[PDB]
């Protein structure tokens, strides 16, 4: 009754459909247990929208012009030094994070303070946690490619999309694995 | 300090930790399970 | 142990109901488990904190009069020399601070000299002894940071607040010589209620009490 | 009724001192709990375990910290053959003016301790070059040890408990840990060696700021994507290389060049990346073997009942064999207590001859610690697996589970297998005790050559066979028509052929009559302590003396005056003894590493060829002449350095007098002697007001042999690492 | 007391090889194994050395060489006097070679 | 040098061929008597959450839809002999053209 996972038949003994963007991807059973399952679900949920605020981040940041690079960030002189957020960067989100534990605790569920729903806006429909949760996981698979670009091809990841539309035989995965590592390390 | 970060001790810290863990401590050591030994259910 | 507490969310100690005013719930270590240890506790507190407010106000009025550094005032001339003036203070404590804890003894209250307890003006209310709790932590969390200042900065209250001033970007405490050491310590303190809180999630029925040698609650253990 | 014994409701109940001593040994025998399952069993030795976890990243960061404070780590770099390590600062306030003068070692201001632990080589071998580097590993093993702490938290909550069939699950746990354990464990150790520790000693420093932009090989990982995984091995580091900068160096992350670096005396850093790229790919391969959750595996308990020999050779084979390793925690622990000690001895036997970091052949004294540590150590673990066998056999070992297996029928004949092995031990002893009084009495009477002289024609052999031209021996691997030398002819037998060509490294030394004589002794040692433990062993459950022995308990301590007498009957008794002779083997294969490596240093190897035949010889120039510095650490005249080793020497005597005082002696006439204090104290003005509230009761049998064998023990440990660390300090 | 007692002596009787003290050295050392072999008797239970007997009965019974008394371990009060008997035997036979080579050799 | 493209195919494609075609028949007649229907049989019983992580997986008894049994893991498994099988020819080669020659003379 699934859109289901991979070609066809694989039948998921824990996870019957209701759960959002279910599709039996579980090859190896890690979410059997029901307490640990919605937690995971959760936990899910998280990843995916920090994800998503990283590479929207990321492709803003380029798109808009800026000088640094996103992974180069770190060590660039800016208003306030490294040693100045980490103070109140942590106890801020430390206090925002213990809040949503002590509300995580009796309501199962996301949200920023207090009101758990947490929708000025509403139109909270399954459809919707659907599409959150799979854009999501979109997320996490474009993160993990930012990354694997700063690491292998050490460029911008719009740059490196523009290099695939330039030269797509020529800048493919076996030139970026074989012809850059001697290159771009100093190019 | 030129990445001195992962804190380095002061030069008189032996002064006040070798006898805070060679006097002290095993004092504690003593005192606590002696307490704990004579205690009746 | 009141419904605002130490961090949001937190759970009070089973000796931490509440009854006695200040309550936020903080006592990780659980120093205090016994209402006469408990209530011993609360009067050094007050005594701490009167000091405390005491000592800061005068730092205020000092700095702000344009008097020299209290670390180094110390070493400035003074009339009557320092042994008998010494002397003297023993003298006059040893009677001030028996009077006060016999009053404690026979009545519990912080009374001056004679006088217990000593409120002629007579505005004695609970909300009273919670503003002057308040005020008191805060004035030892003062003191605290002017004995840093004057430690690392070398520098009044005042210097301090100007440099703050100025550029509160860089001349704050962690950029200092004490800075990342501040920095790991807050971070720690930001992680600290949520391992409480896992704790708590974890140990949904245990008891989970911290047993330490400054306290008996290890007896229930075993 | 008392609360200490919280795991023994029936130890709280002794109104005697015996609670504490017995509560403190019962500390961690949870089979023998009161009221305590399998599961909770299981789970409270997987905290356990977390928490030793903890204690060792604890400990080696205790270590690191230590080295980057108070350490001349830097100094060492800068200069490894002159300066000396240091391990930690000492501030003793009882130390005197000229005991703080003869501590400040290694160009230091305080009093400070030499470290022979070889961590300094170790570290400049991986590429650690600053203490800032120290800190942080220091700082990153403490976050990783609390990280287990919580870890062994977490694994004792509810909805976080395993399952007593989790621990029970061997081919998965066999499969990951010997997949990512060993293998992407080695990998990821393999490549730091490449990244970091082969540019660092080429002069190119290689950080966490500059590691992402500075590249291994020049190549760029060309060679591992296709096949050309030689360019890898094309321009090694030549003979005339430094370890620090990049003189006459090469661009070679994996090479298989063998032998030693010509400069730091060790072996190379390409060689042991490969060895380690390599045995994690063999690994890695060997942990995709056992059945999981998909259609394809190994099941052990079907490889264990179908290797059963035809024509009943060892009757039902392994058959019952999977459930009995698998209940039985104390087969599993013994036989991992068995693989570890082994390899523990091979490590020590291949430290030495094949140094892997930097100058640590240099440094003589660090390596005579590291092998007599590692050797100890692996001694009593062997001793801890027999043991522990031994309780397998008498407390977990089902009969009717396992009939007619190997385990069965080894038990059935045991009687034989005890009688051979005492048969092999008592001719050792008496041809090896023969032969040796015989040489001695023979260099008594002013005729040296009149000794037995068997020349180890059987070792010599093999090291011939291994490419060793000296004995003349024209085998295979030395002469150049064989078709073993002619294999491997360019990959690295010119390295190895010259590392074992040279005597002045400790690669497979030349041995004498002596050698062969000493080897005797500690094959004598090895043959008698594995006799004595497998008696005890397979006597453990049973015996013609005591048939009920399985019904008292793995440490009891004895049956009584009945049946002519049955003192130290058990087999934790039999271990008690045992470990005596353990000592005395390992005392035996030290005193023989020390002795020839001592006469290697010095450079007359020829003293140790002609003296280590006779034991007067032995004993004069080994515990007489090297023990002359040792004794002089504070003489009347003065006090030197060694002062403490001095101390400690004496000490360990002393510690080893008081083993006796508990051995020799056994409760009973102490109970009496009790007595007579009790009266005293009980009939005294002025202190009969303090009463004891545990009675004062003299040390069980069990107990007495216990303290005996610690006391022993430790004072034997620290006399001989006294002697050993002085005697090869006080010249080099 | 160890140093110059102990070490700074008994250099006469190590180095007595070859001379006419040879067998102070020879009787040294057999003192030093007979002094050592007590510690087996000392230490040790009857058990154990019972149940290693039997063993070794089990061996002669195989191929018929069993004797007709039948092998037992010492007793332990048995036991503890060949200890002490071995022991002094061997400190005894210590000293007195160490005093008899030192005191010839030097006086 | 060998192509690496062309070996590690040839490889690949050898073993998965063997696997399907030649060792298949061969194959779970082991495990017929490994955990076959008499034999050992279930790895766990329980039924706790740290029990069915020993269970098999969903996605190994699915009935491929490949003619013969070769499933998702067997393809992994021949596949990883295959890819094993070319870097060893690949690996001999690059030692063969580097003019080392480790075979005995
Ligand atoms: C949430 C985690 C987080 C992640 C994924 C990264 C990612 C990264 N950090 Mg940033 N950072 C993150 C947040 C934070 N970092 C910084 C500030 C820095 C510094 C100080 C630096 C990095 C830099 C780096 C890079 C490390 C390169 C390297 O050698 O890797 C192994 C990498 C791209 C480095 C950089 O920009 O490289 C040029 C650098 O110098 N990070 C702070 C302090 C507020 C953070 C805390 O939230
Ligand atoms: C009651 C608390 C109390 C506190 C917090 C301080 C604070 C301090 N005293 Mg003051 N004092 C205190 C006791 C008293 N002091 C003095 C009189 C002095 C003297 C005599 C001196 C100090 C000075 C100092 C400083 C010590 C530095 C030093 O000498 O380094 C070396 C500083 C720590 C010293 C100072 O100013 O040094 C910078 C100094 O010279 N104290 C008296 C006598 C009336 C005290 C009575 O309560
Ligand atoms: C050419 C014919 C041939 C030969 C020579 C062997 C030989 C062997 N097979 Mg066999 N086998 C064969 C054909 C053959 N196989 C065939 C056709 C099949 C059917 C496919 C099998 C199936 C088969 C199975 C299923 C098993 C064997 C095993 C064995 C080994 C042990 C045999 C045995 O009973 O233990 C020897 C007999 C004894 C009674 C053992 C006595 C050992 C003594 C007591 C120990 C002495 C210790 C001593 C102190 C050591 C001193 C050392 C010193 C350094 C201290 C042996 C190497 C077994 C195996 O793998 O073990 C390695 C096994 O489980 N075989
Ligand atoms: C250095 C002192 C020393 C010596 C020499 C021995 C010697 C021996 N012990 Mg050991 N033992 C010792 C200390 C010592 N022990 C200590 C301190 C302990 C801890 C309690 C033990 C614990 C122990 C156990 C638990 C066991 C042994 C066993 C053995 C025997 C091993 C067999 C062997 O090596 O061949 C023989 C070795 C010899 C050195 C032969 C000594 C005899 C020579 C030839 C002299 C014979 C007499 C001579 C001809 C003169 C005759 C006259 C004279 C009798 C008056 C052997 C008799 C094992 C045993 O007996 O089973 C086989 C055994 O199970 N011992
Ligand atoms: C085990 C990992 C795995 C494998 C081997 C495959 C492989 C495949 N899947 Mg599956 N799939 C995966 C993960 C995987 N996908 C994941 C994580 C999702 C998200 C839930 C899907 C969702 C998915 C859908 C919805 C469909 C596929 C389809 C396909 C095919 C791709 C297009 C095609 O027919 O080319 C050859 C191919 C056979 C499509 C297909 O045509 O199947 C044959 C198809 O309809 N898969
Ligand atoms: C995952 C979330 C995330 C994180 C960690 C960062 C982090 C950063 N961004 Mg980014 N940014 C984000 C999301 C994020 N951004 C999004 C969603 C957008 C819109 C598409 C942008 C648009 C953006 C721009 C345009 C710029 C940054 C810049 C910065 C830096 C300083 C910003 C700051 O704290 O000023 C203080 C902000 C307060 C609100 C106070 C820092 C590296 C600046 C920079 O230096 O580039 C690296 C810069 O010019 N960001
Ligand atoms: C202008 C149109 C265009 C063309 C002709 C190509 C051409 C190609 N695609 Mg690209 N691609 C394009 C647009 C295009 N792409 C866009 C807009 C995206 C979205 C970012 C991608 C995302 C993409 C992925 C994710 C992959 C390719 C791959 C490849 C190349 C395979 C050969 C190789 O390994 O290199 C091939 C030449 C594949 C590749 O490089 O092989 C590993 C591959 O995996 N393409
Ligand atoms: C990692 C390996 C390992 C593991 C898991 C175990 C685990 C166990 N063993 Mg085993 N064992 C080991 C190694 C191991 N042991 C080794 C290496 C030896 C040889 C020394 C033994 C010998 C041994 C025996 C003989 C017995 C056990 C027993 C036990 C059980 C409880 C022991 C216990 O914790 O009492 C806690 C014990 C103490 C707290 C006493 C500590 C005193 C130590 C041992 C003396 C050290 C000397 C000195 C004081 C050190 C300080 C020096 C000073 C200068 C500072 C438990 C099943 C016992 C058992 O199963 O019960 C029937 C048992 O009879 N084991
Ligand atoms: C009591 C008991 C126990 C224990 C036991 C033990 C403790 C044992 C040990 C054992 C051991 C400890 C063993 C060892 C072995 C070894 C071996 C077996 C080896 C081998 C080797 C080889 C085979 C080699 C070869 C070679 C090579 C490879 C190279 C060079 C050349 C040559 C050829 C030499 C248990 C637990 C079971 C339980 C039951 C009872
Ligand atoms: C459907 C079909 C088909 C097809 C098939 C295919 C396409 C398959 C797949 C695939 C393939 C075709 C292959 C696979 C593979 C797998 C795997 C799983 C692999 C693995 C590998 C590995 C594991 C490696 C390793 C390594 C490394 C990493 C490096 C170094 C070296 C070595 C080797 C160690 C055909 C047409 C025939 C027919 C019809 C149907
Ligand atoms: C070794 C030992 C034994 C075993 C020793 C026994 C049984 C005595 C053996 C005496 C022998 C048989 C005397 C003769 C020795 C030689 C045969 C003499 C050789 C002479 C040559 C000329 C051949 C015990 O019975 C015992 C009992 C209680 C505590 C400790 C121990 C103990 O340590």
């Given at each position: 009754n699934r859109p289901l996972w991979l070609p066809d038949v694989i039948p998921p003994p824990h996870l019957n459909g209701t759960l959002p963007g279910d599709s039996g991807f579980d090859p190896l059973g890690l979410g059997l247990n029901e307490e640990r399952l919605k937690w995971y679900v959760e936990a899910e949920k998280m990843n995916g929208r920090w994800a998503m605020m990283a590479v929207t981040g990321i492709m803003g940041q380029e798109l808009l012009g800026v000088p640094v690079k996103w992974f180069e960030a770190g060590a660039a002189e800016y208003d306030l030094p490294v040693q100045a957020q980490v103070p109140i960067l942590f106890l801020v989100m430390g206090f925002l994070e213990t809040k949503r534990f002590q509300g995580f605790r009796e309501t199962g569920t996301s949200g920023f303070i207090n009101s758990y729903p947490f929708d000025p806006v509403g139109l909270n429909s399954p459809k919707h946690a659907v599409n959150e949760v799979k854009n999501g996981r979109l997320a996490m698979v474009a993160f993990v490619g930012f990354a694997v670009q700063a690491l292998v091809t050490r460029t911008q990841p719009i740059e490196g999309l523009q290099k695939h539309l330039a030269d797509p035989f020529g800048k493919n995965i076996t030139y970026y694995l074989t012809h850059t590592p001697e290159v771009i390390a100093g190019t | 300090a030129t990445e001195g970060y992962p804190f380095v001790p002061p030069d008189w810290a032996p002064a006040l930790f070798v006898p805070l863990t060679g006097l002290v401590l095993p004092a504690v050591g003593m005192a606590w399970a002696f307490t704990y030994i004579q205690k009746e259910r | 142990a009141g419904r605002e507490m130490w961090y949001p969310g937190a759970t009070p100690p089973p000796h931490l109901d509440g009854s006695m005013l200040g309550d936020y719930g903080f006592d990780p270590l659980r120093l205090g488990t016994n209402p006469d240890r408990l209530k011993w506790f609360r009067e050094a507190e007050l005594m701490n904190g009167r000091w405390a407010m005491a000592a800061v106000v005068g730092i205020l009025f000092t700095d702000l009069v344009g008097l020299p550094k209290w670390w180094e005032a110390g070493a400035q001339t003074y009339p009557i020399d320092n042994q008998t003036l010494l002397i003297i203070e023993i003298a006059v404590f040893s009677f001030l601070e028996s009077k006060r804890y016999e009053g404690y003894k026979k009545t519990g209250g912080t009374g001056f000299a004679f006088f217990f307890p000593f409120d002629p003006m007579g505005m004695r209310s609970q909300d009273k002894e919670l503003k002057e709790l308040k005020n008191g932590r805060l004035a030892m969390l003062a003191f605290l940071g002017f004995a840093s200042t004057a430690a690392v900065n070398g520098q009044g209250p005042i210097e301090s607040l100007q440099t703050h001033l100025a550029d509160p970007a860089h001349n704050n405490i962690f950029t200092s010589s004490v800075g990342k050491e501040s920095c790991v310590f807050v971070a720690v303190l930001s992680i600290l209620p949520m391992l409480i809180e896992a704790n708590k999630a974890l140990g949904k029925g245990q008891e989970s009490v911290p047993l330490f040698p400054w306290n008996e609650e290890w007896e229930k253990v075993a | 009724t008392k609360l200490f014994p919280k795991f023994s409701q029936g130890l709280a109940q002794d109104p005697s001192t015996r609670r504490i001593w017995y509560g403190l040994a019962t500390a961690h025998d949870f089979e023998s709990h009161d009221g305590m399952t399998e599961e909770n069993l299981?789970?409270?030795?997987?905290?356990?375990?977390?928490?030793?976890?903890?204690?060792?990243?604890?400990?080696?960061?205790?270590?690191?910290?230590?080295?980057?404070?108070?350490?001349?780590?830097?100094?060492?770099?800068?200069?490894?053959?002159?300066?000396?390590?240091?391990?930690?600062?000492?501030?003793?306030?009882?130390?005197?003016?000229?005991?703080?003068?003869?501590?400040?070692?290694?160009?230091?201001?305080?009093?400070?301790?030499?470290?022979?632990?070889?961590?300094?080589?170790?570290?400049?071998?991986?590429?650690?070059?600053?203490?800032?580097?120290?800190?942080?590993?220091?700082?990153?093993?403490?976050?990783?040890?609390?990280?287990?702490?919580?870890?062994?938290?977490?694994?004792?909550?509810?909805?976080?408990?395993?399952?007593?069939?989790?621990?029970?699950?061997?081919?998965?746990?066999?499969?990951?840990?010997?997949?990512?354990?060993?293998?992407?464990?080695?990998?990821?150790?393999?490549?730091?060696?490449?990244?970091?520790?082969?540019?660092?000693?080429?002069?190119?420093?290689?950080?966490?700021?500059?590691?992402?932009?500075?590249?291994?090989?020049?190549?760029?990982?060309?060679?591992?994507?296709?096949?050309?995984?030689?360019?890898?091995?094309?321009?090694?580091?030549?003979?005339?290389?430094?370890?620090?900068?990049?003189?006459?160096?090469?661009?070679?992350?994996?090479?298989?060049?063998?032998?030693?670096?010509?400069?730091?005396?060790?072996?190379?850093?390409?060689?042991?990346?490969?060895?380690?790229?390599?045995?994690?790919?063999?690994?890695?391969?060997?942990?995709?073997?056992?059945?999981?959750?998909?259609?394809?595996?190994?099941?052990?308990?079907?490889?264990?009942?179908?290797?059963?020999?035809?024509?009943?050779?060892?009757?039902?084979?392994?058959?019952?064999?999977?459930?009995?390793?698998?209940?039985?925690?104390?087969?599993?622990?013994?036989?991992?207590?068995?693989?570890?000690?082994?390899?523990?001895?091979?490590?020590?036997?291949?430290?030495?001859?094949?140094?892997?970091?930097?100058?640590?052949?240099?440094?003589?004294?660090?390596?005579?610690?590291?092998?007599?540590?590692?050797?100890?150590?692996?001694?009593?673990?062997?001793?801890?697996?027999?043991?522990?066998?031994?309780?397998?056999?008498?407390?977990?070992?089902?009969?009717?589970?396992?009939?007619?297996?190997?385990?069965?029928?080894?038990?059935?004949?045991?009687?034989?297998?005890?009688?051979?092995?005492?048969?092999?031990?008592?001719?050792?002893?008496?041809?090896?005790?023969?032969?040796?009084?015989?040489?001695?009495?023979?260099?008594?009477?002013?005729?040296?050559?009149?000794?037995?002289?068997?020349?180890?024609?059987?070792?010599?052999?093999?090291?011939?066979?291994?490419?060793?031209?000296?004995?003349?021996?024209?085998?295979?691997?030395?002469?150049?028509?064989?078709?073993?030398?002619?294999?491997?002819?360019?990959?690295?037998?010119?390295?190895?052929?010259?590392?074992?060509?040279?005597?002045?490294?400790?690669?497979?030394?030349?041995?004498?009559?002596?050698?062969?004589?000493?080897?005797?002794?500690?094959?004598?040692?090895?043959?008698?302590?594995?006799?004595?433990?497998?008696?005890?062993?397979?006597?453990?459950?049973?015996?013609?003396?005591?048939?009920?022995?399985?019904?008292?308990?793995?440490?009891?301590?004895?049956?009584?005056?009945?049946?002519?007498?049955?003192?130290?009957?058990?087999?934790?008794?039999?271990?008690?003894?045992?470990?005596?002779?353990?000592?005395?083997?390992?005392?035996?294969?030290?005193?023989?590493?020390?002795?020839?490596?001592?006469?290697?240093?010095?450079?007359?190897?020829?003293?140790?060829?002609?003296?280590?035949?006779?034991?007067?010889?032995?004993?004069?120039?080994?515990?007489?002449?090297?023990?002359?510095?040792?004794?002089?650490?504070?003489?009347?005249?003065?006090?030197?350095?060694?002062?403490?080793?001095?101390?400690?020497?004496?000490?360990?005597?002393?510690?080893?007098?008081?083993?006796?005082?508990?051995?020799?002696?056994?409760?009973?006439?102490?109970?009496?002697?009790?007595?007579?204090?009790?009266?005293?104290h009980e009939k005294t003005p002025l202190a009969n007001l303090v009463y004891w509230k545990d009675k004062p009761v003299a040390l069980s049998i069990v107990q007495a042999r216990l303290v005996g064998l610690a006391h022993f023990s430790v004072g034997y440990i620290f006399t001989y690492a006294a002697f050993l660390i002085a005697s090869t300090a006080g010249r080099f | 007391w160890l140093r110059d007692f102990l070490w700074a002596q008994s250099s006469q009787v190590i180095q007595s090889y070859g001379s006419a003290l040879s067998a102070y050295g020879l009787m040294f050392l057999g003192a030093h194994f007979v002094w050592a072999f007590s510690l087996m008797f000392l230490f040790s239970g009857r058990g154990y050395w019972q149940e290693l007997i039997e063993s070794i009965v089990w061996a002669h019974n195989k191929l018929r060489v069993a004797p007709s008394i039948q092998p037992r371990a010492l007793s332990i009060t048995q036991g503890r006097a060949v200890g002490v008997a071995h022991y002094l035997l061997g400190g005894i036979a210590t000293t007195w070679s160490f005093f008899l080579a030192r005191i010839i050799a030097v006086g | 040098l060998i192509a690496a493209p062309v070996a590690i195919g040839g490889s690949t494609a050898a073993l998965l061929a063997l696997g399907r075609f030649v060792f298949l028949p061969y194959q779970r007649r082991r495990t017929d008597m490994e955990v076959g229907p008499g034999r050992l049989g279930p790895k766990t019983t329980g039924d706790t959450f740290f029990d069915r992580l020993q269970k098999p997986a969903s996605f190994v008894e699915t009935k491929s839809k490949d003619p013969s049994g070769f499933g998702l893991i067997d393809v992994l498994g021949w596949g990883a002999l295959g890819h094993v099988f070319g870097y060893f020819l690949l690996a001999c080669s690059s030692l063969q053209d580097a003019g080392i020659e480790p075979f005995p003379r």
């Open positions: - | - | - | 299981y789970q409270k030795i997987f905290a356990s375990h977390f928490g030793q976890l903890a204690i060792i990243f604890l400990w080696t960061s205790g270590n690191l910290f230590h080295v980057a404070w108070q350490g001349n780590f830097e100094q060492w770099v800068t200069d490894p053959i002159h300066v000396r390590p240091i391990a930690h600062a000492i501030w003793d306030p009882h130390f005197g003016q000229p005991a703080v003068e003869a501590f400040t070692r290694g160009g230091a201001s305080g009093p400070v301790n030499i470290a022979t632990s070889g961590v300094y080589q170790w570290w400049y071998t991986i590429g650690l070059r600053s203490n800032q580097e120290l800190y942080v590993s220091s700082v990153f093993l403490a976050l990783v040890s609390a990280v287990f702490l919580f870890a062994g938290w977490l694994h004792l909550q509810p909805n976080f408990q395993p399952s007593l069939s989790w621990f029970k699950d061997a081919e998965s746990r066999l499969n990951h840990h010997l997949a990512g354990l060993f293998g992407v464990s080695s990998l990821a150790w393999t490549g730091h060696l490449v990244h970091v520790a082969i540019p660092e000693s080429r002069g190119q420093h290689v950080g966490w700021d500059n590691f992402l932009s500075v590249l291994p090989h020049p190549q760029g990982l060309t060679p591992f994507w296709s096949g050309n995984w030689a360019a890898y091995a094309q321009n090694p580091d030549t003979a005339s290389h430094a370890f620090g900068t990049a003189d006459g160096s090469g661009t070679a992350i994996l090479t298989f060049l063998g032998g030693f670096h010509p400069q730091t005396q060790s072996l190379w850093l390409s060689d042991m990346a490969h060895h380690h790229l390599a045995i994690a790919v063999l690994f890695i391969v060997a942990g995709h073997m056992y059945r999981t959750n998909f259609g394809i595996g190994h099941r052990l308990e079907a490889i264990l009942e179908a290797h059963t020999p035809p024509a009943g050779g060892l009757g039902a084979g392994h058959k019952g064999l999977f459930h009995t390793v698998n209940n039985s925690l104390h087969f599993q622990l013994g036989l991992a207590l068995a693989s570890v000690g082994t390899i523990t001895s091979l490590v020590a036997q291949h430290m030495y001859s094949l140094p892997p970091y930097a100058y640590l052949a240099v440094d003589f004294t660090t390596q005579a610690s590291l092998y007599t540590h590692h050797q100890y150590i692996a001694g009593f673990i062997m001793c801890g697996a027999f043991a522990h066998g031994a309780i397998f056999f008498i407390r977990d070992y089902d009969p009717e589970q396992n009939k007619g297996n190997v385990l069965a029928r080894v038990l059935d004949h045991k009687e034989a297998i005890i009688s051979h092995l005492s048969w092999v031990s008592l001719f050792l002893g008496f041809h090896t005790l023969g032969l040796y009084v015989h040489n001695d009495v023979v260099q008594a009477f002013g005729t040296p050559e009149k000794q037995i002289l068997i020349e180890p024609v059987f070792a010599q052999w093999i090291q011939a066979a291994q490419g060793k031209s000296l004995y003349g021996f024209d085998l295979l691997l030395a002469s150049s028509s064989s078709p073993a030398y002619s294999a491997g002819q360019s990959l690295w037998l010119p390295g190895w052929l010259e590392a074992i060509n040279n005597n002045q490294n400790s690669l497979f030394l030349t041995i004498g009559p002596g050698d062969f004589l000493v080897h005797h002794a500690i094959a004598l040692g090895l043959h008698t302590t594995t006799l004595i433990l497998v008696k005890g062993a397979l006597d453990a459950r049973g015996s013609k003396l005591m048939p009920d022995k399985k019904d008292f308990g793995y440490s009891f301590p004895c049956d009584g005056p009945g049946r002519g007498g049955t003192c130290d009957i058990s087999a934790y008794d039999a271990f008690y003894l045992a470990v005596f002779w353990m000592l005395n083997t390992i005392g035996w294969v030290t005193f023989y590493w020390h002795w020839k490596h001592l006469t290697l240093w010095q450079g007359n190897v020829s003293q140790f060829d002609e003296s280590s035949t006779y034991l007067m010889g032995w004993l004069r120039d080994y515990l007489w002449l090297n023990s002359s510095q040792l004794i002089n650490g504070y003489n009347p005249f003065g006090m030197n350095s060694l002062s403490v080793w001095a101390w400690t020497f004496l000490f360990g005597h002393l510690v080893y007098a008081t083993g006796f005082m508990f051995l020799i002696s056994w409760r009973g006439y102490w109970q009496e002697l009790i007595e007579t204090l009790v009266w005293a | - | -």
